[PDB]
Design a protein around this ligand. Structure first.
Ligand SMILES: Nc1ncnc2c1ncn2[C@@H]1O[C@H](COP(=O)(O)OP(=O)(O)OP(=O)(O)O)[C@@H](O)[C@H]1O
Ligand SMILES: Nc1ncnc2c1ncn2[C@@H]1O[C@H](COP(=O)(O)OP(=O)(O)OP(=O)(O)O)[C@@H](O)[C@H]1O
Ligand SMILES: [Mg+2]
Ligand SMILES: [Mg+2]
Lengths: 343, 343
């Protein structure tokens, strides 16, 4: 069967909700961005940054988790032979309590997450304020100044040498006091990625576009991957949206499978084409239905957990400007050729 | 009987006052918002923020207490089998002495409130400045830096795994000096919630409409719940108000029950729908009557301890403003249709 297994009906509601949460759908934009990101990670070729953009609601975190699991399963063989290796280190940024991004906390979080191997691996890292303990945890005292933590992290990254270093919600790097300090933050990240030779991938929303192009050097060592949303004007995106709606409808653990493609305009209105938002909506509706133990779904249940107009309006305002900034037309090529003299 | 038991008459005035105080009537808005919040926190589905909007008069605090007691009741059978878990934890935001909201005090109070289980559960928290003591209390040294407290609170939240984190009086987070500080405060809350995977429900007054819509990320990961007051235009609202008032009249531990529905216009004038205002007004009047051992109260008794006009109009100015912004009309729905192209 192409839908949910029928035997889930006898089993209670909790496992049905668990199955729907653990269920993941494949849609053309996700697979295209996934293959592009995997190709870029497989070899950076002098690149130190990947700026993956996309709306609030797209699949960026799920894409990151899928990439990490794929790379781990790819590397496990070589891990069976060569020890002291971590394939992927994936980290999320932290919004600071103060107005300036805390580099010390970023460095100590990197040390914490990066170094969780079997205790057999010992490296007595530089600076005397960082050491192991009786439980395998990494001990970082406040006495350790930030540059010392940077040096220790550089040593650890150089030895372990992960294939890619994920920085989720990278837009938190913009919390700075000086306007010009944005380029300084990006330069600090670039310098960290230079002497370590570790590919840094920056996962962020459209707020990350403030870092998109600063200085020629950062432009050279970065690639722009756009996790575009399924638009409404292009018919093919509409067909993809209807296909993913049907795929979701097939895997709804209900006694009766609801008809869902019919009300696709409402779904596009309240999700803007982002698959994550639609999955959230359907998860909420399914949870409500399973709580009521009703056979099937209705538009009513849909409206109860629907995103309100005001919050959905703000998202599209953010998305409209972000896509406008990231829009590359054939005309833009013409001025580039005209300026260079290739016209 | 549907009212107070008659045995309370023999008991002194203190016992009758206690019985009326611990009594909590139920009204359609209360039960509706309670069910909506229960279904929202039964599963968050990728949502990190709940914005319970309501005037200082409804019943936000008692709704929070009801939710905590309900979930505490629900989690007892699993607690008897599994230790090291807290069903629900919640605190109240602190208005800071200085200009800026103090994150250190917020973090330390959250850690204090969350970590009050039986003394068997030892998790040897991170940061050397956090530990237990001879009396079982959690001691927080002033030398502990704020990010260290944040990491310790994160580890405690992950290990204990609460169902929902309540932040009452959440409008206190707006004590900022920069326009963008207003936003990265909520960004810090969102980072704390994401990194722990814990839903954060924010109960606050209409001042929280400031935190309503900031950027697509916080617009998506938040669901707005409006604790609307019983207005005067809706006949159903008037009927519900009169039913609640009649239940209050029947539940007064008085020797002779007075007729309360007569001065419904006066009661709505001095309460404008807030059930809590009516409740504590009636508590005031009943206590004043019981002080003089009178068999009944009078209009002048209500007038003796009512709410003055100067304040009463002040909530109206705030309330009509918040209800104005929180008004979602069909015109806004069609505006999304035109902008997105689904018209
Ligand atoms: N293709 C997909 N199939 C199934 N579920 C998906 C898919 N894409 C996203 N989700 C759902 O989205 C949620 C994860 O968040 P998601 O990756 O969509 O966030 P994002 O909007 O890309 O990132 P951010 O948090 O930075 O805004 C989960 O509930 C997950 O089930
Ligand atoms: N439905 C209710 N039945 C009985 N008493 C109620 C009810 N709702 C509120 N109260 C009373 O209101 C008081 C608690 O304050 P309440 O939660 O109503 O205030 P609020 O203005 O909504 O919020 P806040 O605490 O932020 O000021 C208590 O005296 C409680 O008895
Ligand atoms: Mg995400
Ligand atoms: Mg209250």
């Amino acid at each position: 069967s192409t839908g949910f297994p029928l035997e889930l009906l006898t089993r209670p509601a909790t496992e049905r909700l668990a199955y729907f949460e653990n269920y993941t759908v494949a849609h053309p934009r996700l697979k295209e961005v996934y293959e592009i990101l995997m190709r870029t990670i497989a070899e950076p070729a002098g690149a130190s940054f990947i700026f993956v953009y996309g709306a609030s609601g797209v699949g960026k975190t799920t894409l990151r988790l899928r990439v990490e699991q794929k790379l781990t399963e790819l590397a496990l063989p070589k891990l069976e032979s060569d020890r002291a290796r971590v394939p992927v280190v994936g980290i999320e940024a932290i919004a600071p309590e103060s107005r300036y991004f805390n580099w010390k906390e970023y460095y100590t979080r990197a040390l914490i997450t990066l170094e969780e191997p079997l205790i057999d691996h010992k490296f007595d890292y530089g600076v005397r304020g960082i050491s192991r303990d009786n439980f395998g945890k990494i001990n970082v005292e406040s006495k350790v100044v930030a540059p010392a933590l940077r040096r220790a992290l550089e040593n650890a990254l150089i030895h372990r040498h992960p294939d890619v270093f994920f920085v989720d919600e990278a837009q938190h790097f913009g919390k700075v006091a000086s306007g010009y300090k944005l380029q300084d933050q990006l330069d600090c990240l670039k310098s960290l990625a230079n002497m370590t030779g570790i590919l840094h991938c920056l996962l962020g929303t459209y707020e990350l576009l403030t870092f998109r192009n600063l200085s020629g050097q950062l432009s050279r060592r970065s690639v722009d991957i756009h996790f575009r949303r399924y638009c409404a004007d292009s018919p093919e995106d509409v067909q993809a949206f209807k296909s993913v709606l049907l795929t979701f409808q097939q895997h709804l653990p209900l006694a009766e499978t609801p008809n869902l493609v019919d009300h696709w305009e409402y779904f596009y209105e309240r999700t803007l084409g982002c698959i994550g938002t639609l999955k959230d909506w359907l998860k909420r509706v399914l949870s409500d239905a399973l709580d009521r133990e009703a056979t099937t779904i209705t538009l009513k249940d849909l409206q109860k957990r629907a995103l309100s107009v005001a919050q959905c309006q703000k998202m599209f305002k953010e998305i409209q400007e972000g896509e406008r900034q990231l829009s590359e037309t054939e005309a833009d090529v013409q001025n580039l050729r005209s300026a260079l003299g290739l016209g």
